[PDB]
Motif scaffolding. Sequence first.
Motif, short mmCIF file in Angstrom:
data_model
loop_
_atom_site.label_atom_id
_atom_site.label_comp_id
_atom_site.label_asym_id
_atom_site.label_seq_id
_atom_site.Cartn_x
_atom_site.Cartn_y
_atom_site.Cartn_z
N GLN A 1 -55.12 -15.60 39.97
CA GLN A 1 -54.52 -15.76 38.27
C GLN A 1 -55.25 -14.98 37.10
OE1 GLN A 1 -51.75 -17.84 36.73
NE2 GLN A 1 -52.57 -16.39 35.15
N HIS B 1 -56.90 -14.30 34.58
CA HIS B 1 -57.85 -14.68 33.41
C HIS B 1 -58.52 -13.49 32.63
CE1 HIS B 1 -57.56 -18.36 35.48
NE2 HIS B 1 -58.53 -19.08 34.94
N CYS C 1 -63.13 -15.73 33.51
CA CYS C 1 -62.83 -16.72 34.76
C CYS C 1 -63.30 -17.88 34.89
CB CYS C 1 -63.29 -15.55 35.93
SG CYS C 1 -65.18 -15.61 36.27
N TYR D 1 -66.69 -25.20 32.20
CA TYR D 1 -65.46 -24.70 31.98
C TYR D 1 -64.16 -25.61 31.61
CZ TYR D 1 -66.58 -24.82 37.09
OH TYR D 1 -67.00 -25.28 38.16
N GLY E 1 -61.39 -25.77 31.97
CA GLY E 1 -60.15 -25.13 32.52
C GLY E 1 -60.11 -24.49 34.16
N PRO E 2 -59.21 -23.89 34.74
CA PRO E 2 -59.42 -23.72 36.44
C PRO E 2 -60.11 -22.54 36.52
CG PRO E 2 -56.81 -24.15 35.76
CD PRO E 2 -57.92 -24.20 34.45
N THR E 3 -61.30 -22.32 37.40
CA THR E 3 -62.37 -21.44 37.50
C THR E 3 -61.96 -20.09 37.94
OG1 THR E 3 -63.71 -23.25 37.76
CG2 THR E 3 -65.01 -21.27 38.11
N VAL E 4 -60.74 -20.05 38.71
CA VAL E 4 -60.03 -18.74 39.57
C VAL E 4 -59.30 -17.79 39.06
CG1 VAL E 4 -58.26 -20.31 40.34
CG2 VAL E 4 -59.15 -18.51 41.94
#
Length: 36
Positions: A2, A4, A8, A13, A15-18
């Motif tokens: 994804q 970002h 990242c 965070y 939100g999603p780390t990836v």
Amino acid sequence: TQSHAGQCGGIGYSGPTVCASGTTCQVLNPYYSQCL
């Protein structure tokens, strides 16, 4: 995988780390990890 644009993660965070690609989700300071 994804796209970002820079932040990242950052430990704590909201939100999603990836991210997408490059090499890593790399540490600057422990609380700031960046898409490098």
